């Protein structure tokens, strides 16, 4: 049977078992070779698909297809024993997400799929035959690989000419290696979007080098040291560098010549000051500088000198008084300054009537200046934990204000004119049910008449 | 059938210049990167140069800078590597690769026989 059905993988069959298989071969060696199917791993393989596929139907699958995050049909295979044949009749398709499944093959039926474009390989080794991976060359844009071992990812990554997205969550840092695991990337002339997670001790060589055509690099090293030493010096496109969880311990110094630069994000990197704003005065596009989930004792003066700041993030850090050249900046419109040690909050913030959200969480706020309340451009304030005697009644001259959060403060009394507004409902304004109780019950019937939809 | 397989190994004290070389075999060099990678006994393979596909861009090592130079040669569907007096330190055994030419098959790198070059 292995010499004619090609199933080299049926062992050899032990005593008491043999003895009767060789009883029946006397009779007749076709029921051997009829029972002889099931002692074939192959064909247990086979039967597993098979069942697989006649178990999830077409229409199983179709009615567990979810919208991801980009608002597109996302189709999540958890710890499944393979990928349905039915899986790759979903034409709209356009994330396959694989998590845990063993020894998975793509077969070249995934060409079926056009809608498709992103690839998800959670802790799965995909070996994919030459139809499949010509259309994954021609029709990929993301790929999320997380990963253990450098050997259990796929060899073919590099061979994605089209890919734009490229996610890694492993362990790159392989044995006294400058991570020639990665050094194809330079195959890649279309990736916008780099993800590495894989507790990066010096920048790889590779990585600064495709940067030239990079726009969203994300690094995270869950603390680890990294030291960047002149390495982003020769990108000139790059608008967003996230760093979070990069131990830097400073801003680098590399990282002023970055001027098409939009968002900045370096949560968790211990550092300890940031009087590189001075320095910062060279991009003249930055408009998200996030450095939250850090330790920066005071905000330093040099913040005014820039006036493109629209989206501040300076939240749990330890940041004794807000300064007023800070205000300068007339377009914020998310600036967040929460979990802080703050005290009050100067007038000159009712100068920026651009702003949008809001966050002053944790922060020992007394009072709000009137000339804050001035501006009518706000959107979501949210002021959680913070000690607050009164409620200023000239919030209720606020039209676009959208929401509010006023939970964990020390609050007793609400203006009557807060109801007045032409939009609000019960999900913008969430408090406590004994403080909603002060307002006069005409305008909670009402409000509650015009929350159905 | 695709295969690599490169020559000019040769035991040359330091002061002189070795004028590497390879061949590709079923696939044209231009539209494949080709990369240089070197090994050394007790030690793992360490990458030498690098030129891009689509550009022919020379992409070199922080440890080989500026001292190598590669070219891509389509007459005789070769790469060449050419250092400039080559330190003792830099004996090693020198290995070609190309990843995910044109033909996408379950072999997706394809490496050479391997040349060692002698510097004392």
């Known amino acids: 049977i292995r010499e004619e059905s090609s199933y080299s993988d049926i062992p050899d069959v032990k005593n008491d078992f043999a003895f009767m298989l060789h009883l029946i071969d006397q009779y007749d060696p076709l029921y051997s070779k009829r029972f002889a199917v099931f002692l074939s791993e192959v064909s247990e393989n086979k039967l597993r698909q098979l069942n697989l596929n006649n178990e999830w139907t077409l229409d199983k699958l179709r009615q567990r297809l979810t919208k991801n995050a980009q608002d597109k049909l996302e189709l999540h295979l958890f710890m499944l024993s393979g990928i349905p044949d039915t899986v790759f009749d979903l034409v709209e398709l356009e994330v396959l997400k694989l998590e845990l499944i063993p020894d998975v093959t793509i077969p070249p039926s995934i060409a079926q799929l056009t809608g498709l474009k992103e690839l998800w390989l959670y802790h799965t080794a995909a070996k994919i035959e030459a139809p499949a991976l010509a259309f994954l060359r021609e029709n990929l844009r993301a790929l999320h690989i997380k990963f253990t071992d450098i050997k259990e990812i796929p060899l073919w990554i590099y061979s994605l000419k089209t890919l734009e997205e490229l996610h890694l969550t492993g362990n790159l840092s392989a044995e006294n290696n400058r991570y020639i695991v990665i050094d194809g990337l330079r195959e890649l002339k279309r990736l916008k979007v780099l993800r590495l997670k894989s507790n990066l001790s010096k920048l790889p060589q590779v990585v600064t080098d495709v940067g030239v055509h990079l726009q969203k690099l994300s690094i995270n090293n869950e603390g680890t040291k990294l030291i960047v030493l002149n390495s982003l010096k020769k990108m000139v496109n790059l608008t967003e560098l996230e760093l979070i969880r990069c131990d830097l311990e400073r801003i680098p110094h590399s990282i002023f010549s970055l001027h098409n630069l939009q968002e900045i994000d370096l949560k968790d990197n211990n550092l300890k000051t940031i009087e590189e704003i001075i320095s910062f005065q060279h991009l003249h596009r930055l408009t998200c500088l996030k450095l939250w989930y850090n330790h920066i004792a005071y905000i330093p003066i040099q913040i005014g000198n820039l006036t493109n700041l629209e989206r501040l993030y300076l939240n749990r850090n330890k940041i004794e008084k807000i300064p007023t050249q800070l205000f300068y900046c007339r377009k914020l419109r998310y600036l967040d300054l929460s979990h802080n040690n703050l005290t009050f909050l100067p007038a000159d913030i009712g100068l920026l009537q651009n702003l949008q959200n809001l966050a002053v969480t944790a922060n020992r706020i007394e009072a709000l200046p009137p000339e804050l309340f001035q501006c009518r451009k706000l959107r979501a304030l949210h002021l959680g934990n913070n000690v607050l005697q009164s409620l200023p009644s000239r919030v209720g001259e606020l039209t676009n204000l959208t929401q509010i959060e006023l939970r964990g403060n020390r609050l007793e009394c609400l203006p009557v004119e807060l109801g007045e507004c032409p939009l609000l409902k019960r999900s913008g304004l969430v408090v406590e049910e004994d403080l909603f109780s002060t307002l006069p019950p005409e305008v909670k019937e009402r409000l509650w008449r015009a929350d159905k939809e | 059938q695709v295969q690599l397989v490169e020559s000019g190994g040769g035991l040359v004290q330091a002061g002189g210049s070795l004028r590497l070389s390879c061949a590709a075999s079923?696939?044209?060099?231009?539209?494949?990167?080709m990369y240089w990678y070197r090994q050394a006994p007790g030690k793992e393979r360490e990458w030498v140069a690098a030129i891009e596909s689509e550009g022919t861009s020379t992409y070199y090592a922080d440890s080989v800078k500026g001292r190598f130079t590669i070219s891509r040669d389509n007459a005789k569907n070769t790469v060449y590597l050419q250092m400039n007096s080559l330190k003792p330190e830099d004996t090693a055994v020198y290995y070609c690769?190309?990843?995910?030419?044109?033909?996408?098959?379950?072999?997706?790198?394809?490496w050479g026989q391997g040349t060692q070059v002698t510097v004392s």
């Open positions: 079923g696939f044209p060099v231009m539209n494949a990167g």
């Open positions: 690769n190309v990843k995910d030419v044109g033909d996408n098959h379950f072999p997706y790198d394809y």
